[PDB]
Amino acid sequence: AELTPEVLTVPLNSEGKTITLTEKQYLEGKRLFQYACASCHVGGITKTNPSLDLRTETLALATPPRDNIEGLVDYMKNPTTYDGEQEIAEVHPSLRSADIFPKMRNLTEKDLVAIAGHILVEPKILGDKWGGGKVYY
Amino acid sequence: TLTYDDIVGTGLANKCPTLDDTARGAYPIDSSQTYRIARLCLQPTTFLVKEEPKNKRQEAEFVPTKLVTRETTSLDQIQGELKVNSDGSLTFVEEDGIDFQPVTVQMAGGERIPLLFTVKNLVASTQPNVTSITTSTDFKGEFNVPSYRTANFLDPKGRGLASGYDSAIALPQAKEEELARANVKRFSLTKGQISLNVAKVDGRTGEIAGTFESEQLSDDDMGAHEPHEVKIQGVFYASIEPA
Amino acid sequence: VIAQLTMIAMIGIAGPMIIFLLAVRRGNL
Amino acid sequence: MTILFQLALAALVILSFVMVIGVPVAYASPQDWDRSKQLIFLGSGLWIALVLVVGVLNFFVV
Amino acid sequence: LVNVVDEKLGTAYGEKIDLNNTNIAAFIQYRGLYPTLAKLIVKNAPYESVEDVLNIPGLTERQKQILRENLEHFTVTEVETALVEGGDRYNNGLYK
Amino acid sequence: NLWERFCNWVTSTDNRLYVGWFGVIMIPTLLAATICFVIAFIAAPPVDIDGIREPVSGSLLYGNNIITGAVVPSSNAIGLHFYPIWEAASLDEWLYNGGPYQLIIFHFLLGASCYMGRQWELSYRLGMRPWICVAYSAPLASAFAVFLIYPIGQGSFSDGMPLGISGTFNFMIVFQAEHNILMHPFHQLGVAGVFGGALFCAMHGSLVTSSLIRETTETESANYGYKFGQEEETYNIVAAHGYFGRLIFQYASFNNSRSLHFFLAAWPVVGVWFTALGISTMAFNLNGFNFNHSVIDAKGNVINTWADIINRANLGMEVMHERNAHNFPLDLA
Amino acid sequence: LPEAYAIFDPLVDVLPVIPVLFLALAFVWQAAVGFR
Amino acid sequence: RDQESSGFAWWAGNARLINLSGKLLGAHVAHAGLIVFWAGAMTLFELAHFIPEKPMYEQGLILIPHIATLGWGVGPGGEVVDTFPFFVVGVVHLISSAVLGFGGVYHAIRGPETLEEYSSFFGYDWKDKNKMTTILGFHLIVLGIGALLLVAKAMFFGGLYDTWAPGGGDVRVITNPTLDPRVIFGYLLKSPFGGEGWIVSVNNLEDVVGGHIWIGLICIAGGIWHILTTPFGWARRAFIWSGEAYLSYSLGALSMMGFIATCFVWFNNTVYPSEFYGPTGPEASQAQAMTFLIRDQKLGANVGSAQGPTGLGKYLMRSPTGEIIFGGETMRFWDFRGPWLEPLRGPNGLDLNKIKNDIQPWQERRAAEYMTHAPLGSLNSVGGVATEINSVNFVSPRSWLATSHFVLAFFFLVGHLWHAGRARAAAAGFEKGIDRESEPVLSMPSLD
Ligand code: CLA
Ligand code: CLA
Ligand code: CLA
Ligand code: CLA
Ligand code: CLA
Ligand code: HEC
Ligand SMILES: CC1=C(/C=C/C(C)=C/C=C/C(C)=C/C=C/C=C(C)/C=C/C=C(C)/C=C/C2=C(C)CCCC2(C)C)C(C)(C)CCC1
Ligand SMILES: CC1=C(/C=C/C(C)=C/C=C/C(C)=C/C=C/C=C(C)/C=C/C=C(C)/C=C/C2=C(C)CCCC2(C)C)C(C)(C)CCC1
Ligand SMILES: CC1=C(/C=C/C(C)=C/C=C/C(C)=C/C=C/C=C(C)/C=C/C=C(C)/C=C/C2=C(C)CCCC2(C)C)C(C)(C)CCC1
Ligand code: OEX
Ligand SMILES: [Cl-]
Ligand SMILES: [Cl-]
Ligand SMILES: [Fe+3]
Q: Can you spell out the DSSP letters for H221-245?
């Protein structure tokens, strides 16, 4: 097995559009994930709130849907709860609250896409391991 | 007055606030206002456990016990609804707060008696027609006593209610019918009776204080054995303010 | 990138070089 | 300004590398060294100068 | 001598989300229930029937529309003490 | 005066057991710890070690044997708080909260520390060289690690090694789960210390036994060939060197007895020193190597190694140890 | 680091290891004199 | 300079410098150079790899947090506003190492072999009790001055970083240092056990600055004392007066100081600000209980009456003396004090009403931040417990600092035992073995 263009082909928006990231986009797409996300989101779970993981199936049932690139990029700009009723920028790292989360300051628009892509590509690789927990270690 | 750094390590943190002996007044109760207990505190001073008399005709006696879990026994910052029943009698319905403390006492002989000193879901009422709370007002009511352990608790052999084994895996081919009471856990829920007698009243601030006497059952260990009847005596404090 | 390796080269050899120089000069070793 | 700063800074490094090897060799040196406390005093006084020079020229480049 | 929790798995509790017993983290399996509506349901528990969840005071028209769409995923059984005590409905001690 | 006469008897080199100024502290503290240990091991009531009102039985009278028996560590509710007898409302409370454990380990560590200093003292009173106490510092350091240093780093004397055979095992198993001590070089050095120590022990023992000069007959023990206090050696070190020097090769063998015995002392002491420091450094959660999911294929799949199998085992210990003590997903204390 | 001193970035990443080399240098000098 | 003449082998070659004041002077000055060298080279290294917006304790830094604590290059919340002071400290220390390195080499391989007949002031004898106390006095004054430098920094030159500063951590000038001996020496008489913590429990800069004022004057006065005086009779008969004996006395001291430093950086979050070093062990554990109390309360949980599996409170319980504390396994850490938690602390401990209504988002951010940055890491720097998978590259600076200085402290204790034992034997005359012909034991009566 290898990192094929079919694997790196992730949903772009809410209407079925698709994009294919390069291998290098995925690689530093992981570095940036380890830079500002892995502290709470290592392995696809959430240490500060285990009830919510980064599994594709979970992101899909989120409001608004986060199972695409634009959905995750929008979340990294303005994060909300699982039903989207409240905005949680004051307790979740974002560009909107980059002042209290300094590691979100120097993240370009291109950087968020790589981060979003990595979250979508990994479960297509690790399967149930991504967002699984210690059970799948 | 006094900060955390003045009280820390002293044991005063387990003590309920006291009123000066000057506080023998009365607190007026208006029928058209709504009242609440902003803070309720219960400090036990004596744990009496009804022993179990052999088996003949004896009158069951409450023997003294020894606390072994140190000063971790008080219930504090309990708040709830202070209702004015139109008959004049008041009624306190407990809502939230530290309304439970696990306590272990040791009887003569060495037998330790674990219990859940609590006042959860307490509904205590007074005598009819109470225009003011005096130094004669006493509260009578009942409360719920949930299981000492919750459903996730596992015994030394890994058995439990909402979790764990359902048999003795150390005895694979043993007759499970005799170990039924030990293999099958049961969540208990009984009623407890408590009397809150007021002896001090500050009508200005709305603070009341006195002694109490509660009766409840002790831990039954998920239904493994029979619980002991416990009688808890101590002092209490309460601040009353309009809603 | 391997300027990396050039630094540890001259610095690392700087020690033994003194010993080698003091040997061929038969200095107070 | 930068023209003088980096030169004095690059020379300070080069001089030091000579001093690092030169000084202990000159000391442990039996013969051959009325020859060399001149060059010890040479580099030393010149080392202190370069340190001050780079130290001064620092505020003009950063 | 019966395990009440195991026995409850033989009811609708083992099938759907019991509004009177099931842990609050279960409302994540469906859209627009967690955490706003989830909090309200558990707080206003128990209910005599499933459709009583529509009678919670303060619900907006969109919220009541979301609740109706998930009535098929909800159920109501007798309140089990072993499942509601210790604040287990908000945290039953399970994570990942 | 009778003060220097007292000082003469204390530092007397003619007592059957040397006291000394270190022994002035050593004797009462060891007697206090021993007496309390023996009493507690037999008759002490169950102890709420994890501070969760779940008492653990450790004494013989309460359902234990020699293997399962233990003096149970003090409660977690206490933590690092100093808990003497006069800090309890009653002895009943004192026993419930793991009182005896603190009294024992404190009097012991002090007595054991003075034991080391005592070794220097007699060596100085006898005109010996004094580095015997240095060799004793290695097992002493190990004692401080599992009784003091690790409880300090973890913040509770409940996490100190229980005074019991099975309790010791419990300490070892939980340690591996939370620190991966096996994958730590300091414990690996320690294993190399005790394995190598045992090897060199059997080695030096067998080579000297083989070189014993014939002074006895067929019908008597060879041990009688050596008389206590004799001036000449009882074996042939040259013959020993020529045997072992051919077993491997010549220069891999010791021809110097002083250099030989120093190696016999150096190897295990150093090894035990590191495994002592291993426990001491892992007390501040500087754990062993974490190679979990370190090997990855071209796609991204995790290719397991033996470290991943070790990890699966650690997970089993982790999720089972103290099954009712944890309320939150991460084990920090 | 200031952008003016970005020149010596590879040099900076080497300097901390230099003291350790002094410990190793003692063995060179001793080996040079044959461990007298 | 060989074994036949000196009596020492090459692996103990530095023991030949015992009676050579000249070369020994060069050895110490050269070693001093190595110290100042590392202090500068590492600083430049840390600054080179430093990322401003990224936390210090996520970049494996130990020296920059020290400078930051002194108030240089930091602002409100411990945020880095200027990296230039870090550069100066690194450069100045580094350049100075060349100076100490120059005289270190000179005094060693070409300076006079002995100082005693170059100078009577610099030349010394180990057994000269007057000369030793005098040198002791000089260096005592030097240490006293250094302590006043910290005081001067805190009171006159910018100040220090106060993590307890109102409105959040910030650089603050200490204007009222604690001079009360009941407080300063009160710390020295505190228990080393839980709830007390000896001198480690110092929680305000006022006690720190005022403390260094005391120790400043004490060392100076003590310095003057030992300079003008000579060792009393009871002191002359108690100690061993030799070069190795003095070394062992210092080895025991540094060993003790090593153990003290180990406990400081692991427990204290005042002189070691959490914004720079990361959360302490107790701190992170309390933050987890804090983090899930907040999360559950938002869901509608009554954390005051929430019973846990064991019967104890799931979120809140009582300490043995009755203080309201965080529930769970973190009950052991109820003596933790931090600026992010104290706003919720009342007279009887944690106030449930402050918990229900007054908790602020910045407290929630800090709790989650410190929970996920607990000082638990592998040797190869994999963050979290041993069972954690590879992803986060993190080991808290506190772990590096506590572990390293315990290894050193223990070995220096061994050093004390080694060098003191030999100092006794040497001064008595049997460090080279038992005289075959005056074996002391053979002149003693049998034990039985
Ligand atoms: C302040 C510290 C100090 C000082 C000034 C001295 C001074 C002295 N010691 Mg002492 N000693 C100290 C600390 C100190 N010691 C400590 C802490 C210990 C305990 C470990 C010892 C143990 C000790 C012993 C056992 C002996 C001495 C002896 C000596 C004398 C000769 C030393 C020599 O030539 O070593 C030569 C130095 C070496 C051979 C180098 C050793 C390097 C070690 C083994 C490894 C270092 C690893 C490094 C830290 C990490 C890895 C680096 C790299 C590989 C990556 C001298 C009087 C000797 C004596 O009695 O003389 C009379 C002697 O036999 N010391
Ligand atoms: C901290 C480390 C340290 C220091 C400062 C010293 C210092 C000293 N040792 Mg010791 N030594 C050490 C470690 C150290 N040693 C270790 C680890 C070992 C075990 C291998 C030994 C083994 C040892 C022995 C066996 C002997 C000494 C002796 C000496 C003294 C004379 C050395 C001499 O003449 O060399 C001559 C060497 C040279 C001339 C070669 C060059 C040396 C210089 C210093 C190199 C400088 C390099 C540096 C980059 C220069 C920068 C200059 C400028 C830019 C600042 C000297 C005071 C001797 C002694 O006691 O004599 C009385 C002796 O017999 N040492
Ligand atoms: C007080 C000592 C100390 C401490 C606490 C730290 C702590 C730290 N250093 Mg630093 N460092 C130190 C000294 C120290 N360093 C020294 C002296 C040097 C010069 C060589 C360096 C060079 C250095 C570099 C180049 C880097 C660090 C980095 C780091 C970080 C990661 C370290 C790591 O992964 O090590 C890996 C762990 C090991 C290699 C294990 C070594 C174990 C030793 C050998 C144990 C020895 C014990 C004892 C002495 C044995 C004696 C035996 C004898 C008695 C027989 C961390 C913040 C890194 C970082 O993140 O920087 C930003 C980095 O890049 N350090
Ligand atoms: C530990 C420190 C120390 C000590 C005790 C000595 C002692 C000695 N040195 Mg040495 N020396 C040292 C460090 C030291 N030196 C260093 C670091 C260097 C490199 C710069 C030198 C370079 C050196 C040379 C080149 C010579 C000596 C010589 C001498 C002798 C005469 C000194 C004299 O007349 O000073 C007189 C000095 C003064 C009256 C005032 C000095 C003021 C100083 C520089 C600063 C004071 C402020 C403060 C303390 C600075 C602290 C800095 C830092 C530690 C924070 C004497 C044996 C001479 C010798 O042996 O000839 C045969 C000789 O030629 N030394
Ligand atoms: C670096 C510090 C240092 C050092 C190495 C020395 C060394 C010396 N001093 Mg000096 N001294 C110092 C600092 C120092 N002093 C300072 C700063 C002052 C000013 C306060 C003094 C004031 C002073 C006086 C007044 C005297 C000395 C004397 C002495 C000599 C004997 C010391 C002795 O017997 O101690 C060992 C001490 C004892 C055996 C007494 C009991 C000590 C108990 C057991 C300490 C318990 C500590 C505890 C475990 C931990 C600390 C916490 C708390 C309890 C405090 C010796 C030459 C004596 C001398 O001969 O002068 C000519 C003398 O009379 N010193
Ligand atoms: C790197 C900058 C990050 C990215 C990208 C995301 N996070 Fe987080 N996160 C955290 C919590 C406690 C939650 C759950 C709380 C809630 O949603 O109410 C989340 C959730 C997300 C989600 C939503 C997942 C879903 O809807 O199922 C996404 C898409 C997400 N996060 C992306 C906590 C933390 C945290 C600790 C403070 C960090 C550093 C991050 N999150 C980082 C990232
Ligand atoms: C600061 C600076 C500088 C300086 C530097 C220095 C000072 C350096 C030094 C360096 C050094 C000082 C080096 C050294 C090195 C050494 C070595 C590297 C060694 C090694 C050794 C070995 C390897 C050994 C081996 C052996 C022997 C021979 C014997 C025994 C056995 C054995 C085999 C082990 C300069 C100028 C650059 C400039 C920049 C800055
Ligand atoms: C005695 C002895 C010894 C030792 C020795 C020693 C230890 C020495 C030291 C020495 C030293 C200790 C030296 C030092 C030096 C230093 C230097 C030389 C520095 C320099 C610096 C610089 C050059 C800088 C630069 C810069 C600048 C200016 C800015 C920033 C950047 C840069 C970096 C570029 C031994 C053992 C070997 C052997 C023999 C004996
Ligand atoms: C700054 C500071 C402070 C203060 C501090 C102080 C004030 C200190 C002091 C300290 C001290 C004041 C110390 C002392 C010490 C002492 C010692 C360490 C001693 C020792 C001794 C010895 C070791 C002896 C021995 C012996 C004996 C036992 C008998 C006879 C013989 C001999 C001599 C061997 C505070 C906390 C506020 C805060 C933080 C900062
Ligand atoms: O106490 Mn004894 O074992 Ca040290 O980790 Mn946390 O805490 Mn408990 O769990 Mn795992
Ligand atoms: Cl366990
Ligand atoms: Cl927990
Ligand atoms: Fe032998």
A: HHHHHHHH----HHHHTTS--SHHH
Q: Does H348 touch chain A (CB under 8 A)?
A: no
E-assigned strand segments in chain F: 70-71, 163-164, 286-287
Chain-chain contact of H372 with A48 (C-beta, under 8 angstroms): yes
Best residue for ligand 4 mutational test, from H107, H109, H117, H119 (most atoms within 8 Å of Cβ): H107
User: Are residues B4 and H348, on separate chains, in Cβ contact within 8 Å?
Assistant: yes
Is the residue at B164 inside a domain?
yes
Q: Can you tell me the distance from the alpha carbon of B16 to that of B76, in angstroms, rounded to the nearest whole number?
A: 8
Distance CA F94, CA F96 (A): 6
Q: How far is CA B5 from the centre of its chain?
A: 29
Is any Cβ of chain D less than 8 angstroms from the Cβ of G28? Answer: no
Find the domain containing B113 and state its range: 21-149+186-243
Query: Is the bond preceding A64 in cis, omega lying within 30 degrees of 0?
Result: yes
Give CB contacts under 8 A, 24+ apart, made by A109-113: A109/A73, A111/A32, A112/A72, A112/A73, A112/A76, A112/A77, A113/A25, A113/A69, A113/A73
b/e sequence F161-192, b meaning 16+ C-beta within 10 Å: bbbbebbeebbebbbbbbbbbbbbebbbbbeb
Q: Does B175 share its domain with B242?
A: no
| A41 is an annotated ligand-binding site residue | yes
DSSP lists the bridge partners of residue H345 as H350
Chain F positions in Cβ-Cβ contact with residue B106 (cut-off 8 Å): 92, 96
**B171 shares a domain with B137:** no
> Is B177 a domain residue?
yes
Q: Does H217 sit in the ligand 5 pocket, CB within 6 Å?
A: no
Which chain residues have CB less than 5 Å from ligand 12, an ion? F 326-328; H 328-329
Distance, CA of B62 to CA of H105 (rounded, Å): 86
Rounded Cα–Cα distance for residues H326 and H286 (Å): 7
Do B163 and B59 share a domain, yes or no? no
**Nearest-CA residue for atom 20 of ligand 9:** H253
Nearest Cα to H201, choosing from H245, H263, H146?
A: H263
Q: Are strands F286-287 and H377-378 parallel, antiparallel or unpaired?
A: parallel
The C-alpha atoms of residue H53 and residue H66 are separated, in whole angstroms, by 18
Which residue is it, tokens 């060289």? F129
Any CB–CB contact under 8 A between H48 and chain G?
yes
Contacts of F45 in chain B (CB under 8 A): 110, 112
Q: H279-374 — its CATH code?
A: 1.10.10.670
In a domain, E31, yes or no: yes
Q: Which ligand is nearest to the CA of G21?
A: 7
Q: Are residues B145 and B242 in the same domain?
A: yes
Structure-block tokens of residue H116: 């005693």
| H103 C-beta closer than 6 A to ligand 4 | yes
Q: Is residue B15 part of a domain?
A: no
The tokens describing H146, both together, are 């250094």
CATH class of A1-137: mainly alpha
For ligand 3, which residues put their CB under 6 angstroms from it? F 270; G 16-17, 20; H 38, 46, 49, 59-62, 381, 397, 400-401, 404, 407, 411
Radius of gyration, CA atoms only, chain D: 14
User: How many independent structural domains does chain E possess?
Assistant: 1
Q: Is the CB of H306 inside 8 Å of chain E's CB atoms?
A: yes
Q: Is the dihedral of CA F104, F109, F115, F121 positive or negative?
A: negative
Task: Judge whether E38 lies within some domain.
Answer: yes
Which residues on neighbouring strands pair with residue B231, listed in sequence order?
B48, B215
- What was the experiment behind these coordinates? X-ray
Contact present, C and A (at least 3 Cβ pairs less than 8 Å): no
- Residue bearing the CA closest to ligand 6, atom 13: A49
Atom 10 of ligand 9, residue of closest alpha carbon: H188
Residue F327: its chain E contacts at CB < 8 A?
93
Q: What is the resolution of this structure in A?
A: 2.4
Number of domains chain D contains: 1
